[model samples]
Target chain A: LAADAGTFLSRAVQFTEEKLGQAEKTELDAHLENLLSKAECTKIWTEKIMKQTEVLLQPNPNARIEINNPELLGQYMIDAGTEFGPGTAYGNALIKCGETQKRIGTADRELIQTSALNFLTPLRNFIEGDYKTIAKERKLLQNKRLDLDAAKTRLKKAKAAETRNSSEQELRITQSEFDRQAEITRLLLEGISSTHAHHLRCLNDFVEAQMTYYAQCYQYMLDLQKQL
Target chain B: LAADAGTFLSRAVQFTEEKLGQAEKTELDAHLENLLSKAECTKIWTEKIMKQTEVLLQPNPNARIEINNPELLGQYMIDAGTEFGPGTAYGNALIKCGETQKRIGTADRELIQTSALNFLTPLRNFIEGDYKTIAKERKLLQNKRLDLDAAKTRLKKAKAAETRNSSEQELRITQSEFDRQAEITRLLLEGISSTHAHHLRCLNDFVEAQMTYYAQCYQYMLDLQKQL
Candidate 1:
């Protein structure tokens, strides 16, 4: 509903154009990204769905919604309880509530920071820097191919236009230039293999960071749970 | 512009009423949630800010951009190679590229599921079940308190009318009921201590899972990296 009929129709038209190679030359780059991204996104989502269904089907499950990072809760409870005056049952209990809340927040803060730093950072790096570089090279390579094709077209027809250099000479120079650029571009594109390799390490780092963070949190709460 | 002056004025009016106790009694429950939730949200966000700054300040960082589950890329590169005929450099490289992508995906699938089950499940439970229970009891307690207060008001003002025994007797009955409810409510609220404690354990489980996951991923890529 968020999109109009026009959007769907236009998208279909574009798909048709792209398949027939009537679209812009670099259109394949976007389509390639589409295929690859779609594969990953769909694959990941399906695993999640299946597992989620299993848990649901199993009739068993689990939450730690600690977005709080909290001493203020303690303060609020203590201050608010002052309305009940001193030496009151409710007041004393409220104080206990506040104290624990404060404690939990302290623990909460630890996990929040630790996890953010360890897990999220590497993921962010891959996203912000490495991805952009890969995309730029991919785009450059596509345009470079287009440039090579244009030169061929020039040889087939531009001979009639007549320049100081023959169409043969022009085509030869363009072919040489295209060859050099293609090799350079291909090397850069191929380096994505290395990037993926690096990313695997990042994936590990993310898991490590998460593992460490949760491990500490587990201990923190375990102690707290025992004390309570 | 999203909100009119009416919204601002109305909010101001509500704040004034709440502080003066002119607001509905159970209104405080909502207000209390507001306070606690605000504390957690702001606190979490700030820590993230500070740590993020520390990293930026240190001038150092991290990615794992595995969204693909691909045999398609392999097929596309290979099939596209058919366009280039046999013994082609670009074709061979594209094929190699597809093979690794497929390999990384197999690894990626492993981490994604393992992490989701181990880490997220407990957190989801805390959010969905335990927290909701806490909120419900808190509301019930607030309402019970209001009921008790109304009984006191009745003794003070409703003596003009007749009821069971006396306004005094009625107030006595109400107080007894309130006491029972309050104690029950208090016990329920206090269990949040246990909840937080449990959350800490959940936190640990989360960490352990992540640790194992990353450890596996680290090994995976290390082997892949060495091979590459």
Candidate 2:
């Protein structure tokens, strides 16, 4: 029965340590970088496309072309907005696409710049602090888990000895230590997972805004080309 | 009959002299300055108005604004272009304002800058060369006319002298000299007048283009604002 208990405790610790090790390996920086790169690429691509279309259109001040259906274009934007995730701020921005009551003002350019700038600090904070902290905590937990495993093995061996009382007490202390380390690891993992999810949500909103812009520009270019 | 011809000749010479004096006073420097200032003012005003309206028209990435009704704006431009001149190159630019296939692109901003830059040198040349040359040519014509009038008076006195044959020969010489001066004055006046007409035409064209641009900007701004 003692041997059975010993084997069960060993397996339990091994299972936790393995799970902790897996948690330590969750690297999100690459994912964040990829999303950022895609966001930047979309903006550059949109600008280039707009320039190319301008060149293709060969703008003439004297030529008058009708805009086949502006409302349809607006509707297209509203539809594309759905791909951005529902109930999101970006989704709302997309839905507002058809409200053509007011015109694009020069001040809006500044506003857009400011919105983008404001998000940078928070994103950097997540990358530098929360993202790294989670991994570091998981590693600390893994070390504690190794110590607990060693203590359990020693307790098993000590159980076979004449002075088993001291070994039992030591084993209990190691078990408590392992529990504390496991708790810390769990908290750390939770913190990072939630942070990552939030980051992804924010990134999605940002990328969707960019996508919507490019889509509209592409549509506008296509319409203009038709007129040409 | 001789006395009548002498009196008629004196009046004719006086008329030519007075006319030449008027031409000398017709210095176009101030007139040229005013026109140049007006052309420059119109351009600056157009740019200022455009920038302000752009600010008022916050652009949306999702909405597709139709610049199709560019003819309405074009009509406004044609009306404003008339303020510059009629049947001129500027007038032609205003009348051919129906080519609105592609909407205004980002390059339009660059084009505006280039247009304004290109005109500066020509405007300065007109201000320095054409304006001054017109005045200089008029002064030269004035001097020639004065010489002719003086020669005519001398011949008239010579003809009254008792040395009839010598005075008659000298009168012929003076008359030919006067004719030469008169012809020179006539040519200079013609040259300056034509130059003045051409300068005015160019100024009209420059100013007209600027006004048309602003009118379109104002219309676009209003439309964008409505959408907003």
Candidate 3:
């Protein structure tokens, strides 16, 4: 058995008691790691047992194993698994917890950067799209023209009989077709702008999930690091 | 605080005290696994921390830290972005016990073996795809001839039949087909037979889920062993 040199050496020598000699230290580290491995294994096993336990915990005629099966020991095994063994709880505590920590660190860098891009992509796309900004600009100008035409029409009533004015004014007729087409173009542009915003939001959500998953992994690694 | 074991002179004693010689011995034989990934990652990080701990329990949320967060006590602070650490008391005790035991003994050989297969992938692949060279050859002697077995069963059914007419003859024919298919299969099993592929598959699954992962990450010293 590897001795706890910390206390032993503390008693004999003043140099802070150490646990192992150089060579044996390797063995000790191996043993510690092995134990951690076993704990992880047991934790997984316990999880399967727990799932089965929950199934059998309640009184069910269909239950395959008795709640009182000695193997299960009813609450006993559950308690042992939960309270004593390196069952699911323990494994999760170490692995899952570490993953969480790692996740936080990653989020501040990669996640933050990616997240910002997620916000920007759609905005850029909409502006760059062949028919958005320029079309938007054209629409704005067209709107002004329409307002001006309406104002002109309201104030200027071309005399029905001025110099025998034609019953149908070709200019007014041209204005009617232009106004109708301009209104349709304006509505279409509005739709494109809204869709762009929607696209960006979805991208944001996806990036967030991705960041979260990675962060969790880092936390998990940290948690396991302790066991090592 | 556990000190920097940085290149120890007398580690055996310290290891024994910290692990085997502890006043309180906890058993962690009942832990459960949550996800396959957690098991794998835990084993990896556990080994890393144990190695570093051997040198100098590296101070980093990246590995382990005593935390101010009530959520983490007796738990190591994992790096940002992780979610797995914070070994439970039961898990810690199990690791301690495992370190003391050194290796899984014969009593648990089969179970441990099973666990090893499930937890470790490469091992499972070996057993599934490579272990074939070691298996004994199957012999097919003393097996019933299909047609003969069918004829015999027909005779039997005929004898059992109460009806002495065409009905009895019909019974014989029906019995023949059933006997031919069923008896021939049974005979195959009775003879020198190759190991069933499915059976090996099952064993591999069990071992991978249970033992091998733990061994690869914590139990084994050499990376080659982990691969095996």
Candidate 4:
């Protein structure tokens, strides 16, 4: 059974005391501790990568039509280049380059969209989805552990037979709750292994999208160079 | 030869009166008028494209290594991916992808440098170099034109024979200066055609640099894909 209202208050008291080193506290096994650390690190770096990847992909976030949208640059070049050098081959080449740069810009946007769809969302989901639940359950487990420890302390300090009996019953109840919560938290932590696997899959798709984008840009620029 | 200090004062009076619609202002011919407008438009659009292109090329201007430096990202992936998925092929793929991305970033930097050097610099030079000189000389021409107009007006209003003779001499001196400055400005405006030609050449080299950069990135990504 979960700790009752009164027992929760007792657990809180126990938790506070433990924080001050005035009471004994429960400790997790090394494996579980290691898993928790690893999960935290994964979340942190995935977050870092996702944010920077977005910046690298989009570069000019403030620009919907501000600049370097290639088509705009192209048309500007076409008008200015032609007006300045009317009836010249150089004007025509400016148009050619402008058109190609526009195409390259189109390809770049496609890559950004694909990378967001295929990869970036998953990293966010891992952080906001499973990890939030894991954090909640892990916090519950800590509370449960405190309840169990407090009950044991009460049992040792009980003065009368009836007091010992009630304390013993409380100890048994809190022990089961702690164990259940620990198992639940452990299961969630273990789920992080699959998160790593999912991340790997997303990384693959991201790399593929980038590869395609780079190849298309390469083609467009090459064609433009030749025409120029 | 240029307007003397007393003549410059008279020109300023005429220019101010012209602004107030109390004196007639000298006007450019249709061709020079159109050319000046075109040159101004060229400078404005060139400046816009250049600033935006810089933003597009380097989105995170504040970020040298704070994020998306690729080497830092590559290492983060290598450490985190391998730690979370030790001895796994997926972890290996992450490292491979990271490495390729790092290389792509390197190539990207090279492309940015080349674009700055080959294309962007010339655009700025046109604005700051020849355009600045043109703008300064054009202002001087406006002053000359004003002096010419003011002298002619003084001659028309002259009463004494001595007054007429001095006014006529001033008019002759100012007219030559105005014509000289006008020719100088017209020549510079015509040079915009050459500027456009030079821009077309830069665009070719820029396209070539982008082509090579893209091809390198494409090759790197493809190799990563294959490895993954």
Interface RMSD of 2: 24.1
Each candidate: RMSD: 16.3, 22.9, 34.8, 3.6
The interface RMSD values of the models, given in order, are 15.0, 24.1, 22.4, 2.3
Off by over 4 Å in 4: A1-8, A29-38, A61-68, B1-5, B20-22, B26-42, B61-68, B186-193
| Candidate 3, superposed: residue stretches over 4 Å from native | A1-107, A117-119, A127-157, A163-174, A180-187, A190-201, A204-228, B1-228
Model 1, backbone clash pairs (residues 3+ apart or across chains), number: 19
lDDT of 1 by residue, A42-119 (tens): 224323422332221121122221123235545655664454433654445445545655664565456545555653
Residue B181 of candidate 3: its Cα lDDT? Answer: 46
- What's the true lDDT of residue A146 in model 3? 41
Supply every candidate's count of residue pairs whose N, Cα or C atoms clash at under 3 angstroms.
Answer: 19, 28, 104, 0
lDDT of 2 by residue, B1-228 (tens): 688576556545656656777422223235543444443433333233233223222222122131322233444434533543345443333333312212333324433454444443444555466455445544554454454455545555564556556656756765566556445444434444343344334433433343444444445433432332
**Worst ten in a row by lDDT for model 4 chain A:** A60-69
Q: Candidates 1 and 3: which is better by lDDT?
A: 1
Better of 1 and 4 by lDDT: 4
The TM-score ranking, best first, is 4, 1, 2, 3
Candidate 3: tens digits of C-alpha lDDT, residues B1-228: 235353232333333443554422222112211222223342343334323322211122333332211112112212110222225432333233232223322222344345434433443443444233222111111122222333343444464435345555655664555445444434433321232233234423432332333343333223212221
Q: What value does the lDDT take at residue A142 in candidate 4? A: 74
Cα-based TM-score, every candidate: 0.37, 0.25, 0.22, 0.87
| CA lDDT, candidate 1, residue B54 | 27
Positional deviation of A31 in candidate 3, in angstroms? 76
Off by over 4 Å in 2: A1-129, A132-179, A190-198, A211-228, B1-29, B38-228
